[PDB]
Amino acid sequence: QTRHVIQKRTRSESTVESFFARGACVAIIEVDNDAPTKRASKLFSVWKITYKDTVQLRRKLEFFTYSRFDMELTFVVTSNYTDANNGHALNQVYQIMFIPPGAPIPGKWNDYTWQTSSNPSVFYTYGAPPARISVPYVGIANAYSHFYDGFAKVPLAGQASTEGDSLYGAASLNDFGSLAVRVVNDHNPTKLTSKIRVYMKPKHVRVWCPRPPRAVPYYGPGVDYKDGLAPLPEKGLTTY
Amino acid sequence: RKNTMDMYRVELNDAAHSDTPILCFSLSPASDPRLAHTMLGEILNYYTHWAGSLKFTFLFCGSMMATGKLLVSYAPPGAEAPKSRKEAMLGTHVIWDIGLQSSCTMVVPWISNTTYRLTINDSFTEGGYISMFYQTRVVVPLSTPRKMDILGFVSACNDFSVRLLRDTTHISQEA
Amino acid sequence: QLTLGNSTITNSVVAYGRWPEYIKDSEANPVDQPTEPDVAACRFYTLDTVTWRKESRGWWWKLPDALKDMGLFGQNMFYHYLGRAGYTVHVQCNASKFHQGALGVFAVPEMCLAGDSTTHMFTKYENANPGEKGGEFKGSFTLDTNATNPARNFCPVDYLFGSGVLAGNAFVYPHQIINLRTNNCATLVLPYVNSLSIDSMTKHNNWGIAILPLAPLDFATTEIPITLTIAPMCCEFNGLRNITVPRTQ
Amino acid sequence: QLTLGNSTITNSVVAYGRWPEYIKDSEANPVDQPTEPDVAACRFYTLDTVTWRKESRGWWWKLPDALKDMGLFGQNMFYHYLGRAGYTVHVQCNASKFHQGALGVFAVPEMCLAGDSTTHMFTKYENANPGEKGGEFKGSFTLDTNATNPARNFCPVDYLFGSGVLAGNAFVYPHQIINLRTNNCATLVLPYVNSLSIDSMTKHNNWGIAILPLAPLDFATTEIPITLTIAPMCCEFNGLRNITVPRTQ
Amino acid sequence: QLTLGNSTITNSVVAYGRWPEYIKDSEANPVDQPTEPDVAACRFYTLDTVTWRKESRGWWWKLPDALKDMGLFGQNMFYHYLGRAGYTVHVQCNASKFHQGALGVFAVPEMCLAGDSTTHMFTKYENANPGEKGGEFKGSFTLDTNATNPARNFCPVDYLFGSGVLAGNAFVYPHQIINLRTNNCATLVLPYVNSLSIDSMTKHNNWGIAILPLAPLDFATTEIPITLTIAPMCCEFNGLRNITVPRTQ
């Protein structure tokens, strides 16, 4: 038997919007401001845009099969000296250029591509609050596909083994381009190292076809597993 | 059995009646190991606070010729966890006739001192105990399997809610 | 009694409460006139029967891959760049009142399966698309160590549901339980589920069917057959050209 | 599905067509405010299970004696001079389709039982009130010849229904038959039956439950359990004081 | 003349001007049907009488701890996970017109008391819940230096009101003064005060009763008894299961 309870609890914080209403670190892009001839300093870094370099946001997203959302990107930039015996540096400015698929990838930190006449670029000044941009839903499909049970190519009879071979589960449905990051400043006498942490927040989220969450450690961009295949601990059947 | 399919199966047999439990587990849907990795547990492990009733369904997977009655009990916390059917029957409970219905659902109603329980093992917000016992016994005729399996399922009722989004301990990244 | 075309079958789950339907004019991406073979292809095809034993770990099929050699449906699938279909999946498994056991039949959208190698996403097309024979789940994971001639096959572990998730949670997918003491069949009605209105049937498998023994088969003394009968529904095809002939083996 | 308080049970006889009810103001003898624990005491309690064998002669319990140690109902019973309750008695006995046998479950108002001695009415309180364990009927009457330490116990003979009446006529009492080929349970709803509106629960047992094998248990090869689940109903208590502690053994 | 159940008593303070009341449907956290024993438990129980001497420093009790062994109230308290009750506390202390002295009777919500050790919050459950006997305040603080077998008890200093606050300010709590020249009794009506609608009675003491000699007892020649009579009010209980049996001593 039960009594009458005027329930007041709501599910406001468990809406799909609220569940994803957080900035999650999806990448740590390392760049160096240094003399070009050092050959150990990366004067620019190219990171392919994805949520699969980290696990937390990946697991939350992969609770579902399909998603549709706008994205907010927040860039937190940290920098430090690498040695103390080569003087100091002036405040650095960073270029973060979005290179959509097909646009020329920079080959050098100061090549023509950084003119960014058509690529969106964010110039961030060190010490300023973390840079932020928004993008709408840009999928070429009607939703993003977290899982694609297929191939980009179908091998055909009479084709050699090398031909028609494509990775399982790899489709251009998630080809979103890259971010190219450089320090715009010419080098100081001392080497400086910077990290740009990219934080992703889905907004106006819609999701479809829920899935059981990842239970074993992720292994690659796919659903493959190799290690940690025993997540359940030991517990007696009649032990409270 | 852990980390195999066998971990989902609880074996009943046709032995003589006893009052000892078939299975026992605590009502900690986010932190009890049997419940933590259920879909409900997985969702709750992204939240700090939870409240509401739970549904525990049990499916009997023996032969059609098997008969029996079981007792499924929820004991609110604060007392010794039911060691036998005599104690368990004092709490909330349901009698399940496996011959009649292969599936039995027991609703564990929300009963708590706090308006929300934590999603960790916590004495102050402990949720109580769930146990299963033989009411009479499993009976089979000849030429019938004398051992069979039952399966347990858990879900949240429509009054269930969670609060205080948090990161889960169920996924980690190395290096 | 469920009838489609010339086929008749004599408990039922509509996945996501959505019956299969044709593309609405407001959702149609391709502009050419679609092909709608209707009864000639929208009919029940019976796959090769598999055997449930005490030691069986499970079975899996991919749709439309499992039907690629099913008469006119297969012909239309391989003659068109684009194809769309829902399904009616009818799993048939009868036993005596003295048998026991339970099967979980799960229809999984985008049922990606884990590989067998340290190389990511390395399962080749031939193994990922076995056809009507489908594949089987394994008890444990066996890494393929052959470097010269890698198997490049799935290694789907049963308790990981073949994709690194606990099998107990696979009930979040549309599903039906065949409990031998209660029923001998499961019917799942699957709408076309995809991020596109229509896609390439040969490139992409929209649905996976996973049958796992939730309770092992037992009999007082045993093996019983399981038969899948699948009817594609609301079929549409676009982009007619010469027939696709996928590489095999 | 019958629910009382926190207890649920999932053919039914209302004794004398009278549902249990509370004392009407026009029938209330005591003047103090009654105690009505409701769900805390009005709930199903499961007694210790007994075993039906081929040789079993029968079983008997007394109400409210059988529930005297059942949580808050027992506490209220022993803390009050006066108590009143109906009951829901649920006898549970399942077997296979290949078993046979029948039980007569009789609810008897004022179920007085015959003694075991030449001294009349000599059964002592401890033996007349065995509690949840109840007692068993015998095949024949055995006079207790021990003069030094007389057993002073009941000797209820089955075919005499334990009280010198033919068992075949016990069907005049409210009853239900559990025929293993037809049903596995019996439900008897007993109103409070007494010559008073309310009485002393410790002094007086309002109801007796007698379970007799009308057809002996048989199986082609056997023992099957019988479980009693009794919920007191419409409980009222009066005359609160220090707890009664009856002498035992 | 104040009557509750079968108990009658023949200046009065309602703590915070709030009479005890039952949980409103709009404030009820638990969903199961509450148990409301009413008169059987909502009645005056008389605790063991204490002795006021010239040297007495004070006395303290915890509610519901002081009533845990009080008949059906104690039974309901230990049989339920959740319990809620207000109280009527009646302190009785009569003397002659030639006696003098004054008692401050304070009802303190969440009356936490200081320990006796350098280890914080180290008072064990048995000592924190003495039952009807309660405890006494001390004149000074004595640190417990026994490392092998620490007393793990309260050391409540009277002028610190047992919790590190000046006793003179304890009048901010609901209180009554028994001034022997004016009155011989104090009545405090305490509503259920807590941060929850209902809580565990065994885990949590909602109220503390502190009786301090504001003016020492004196007589021209002396000891006089003090008797506490406490009735729980508007009792509600939830979460019935097997009885809790707390560890003692």
Ligand SMILES: CCCCCCCCCCCCC/C=C/[C@H](O)[C@H](N)CO
């Ligand atoms: C000023 C240039 C830098 C700012 C522009 C950043 C470009 C972002 C465009 C790509 C959009 C990616 C959206 C998220 C990709 C995820 O893999 C999918 N949403 C997965 O569901």
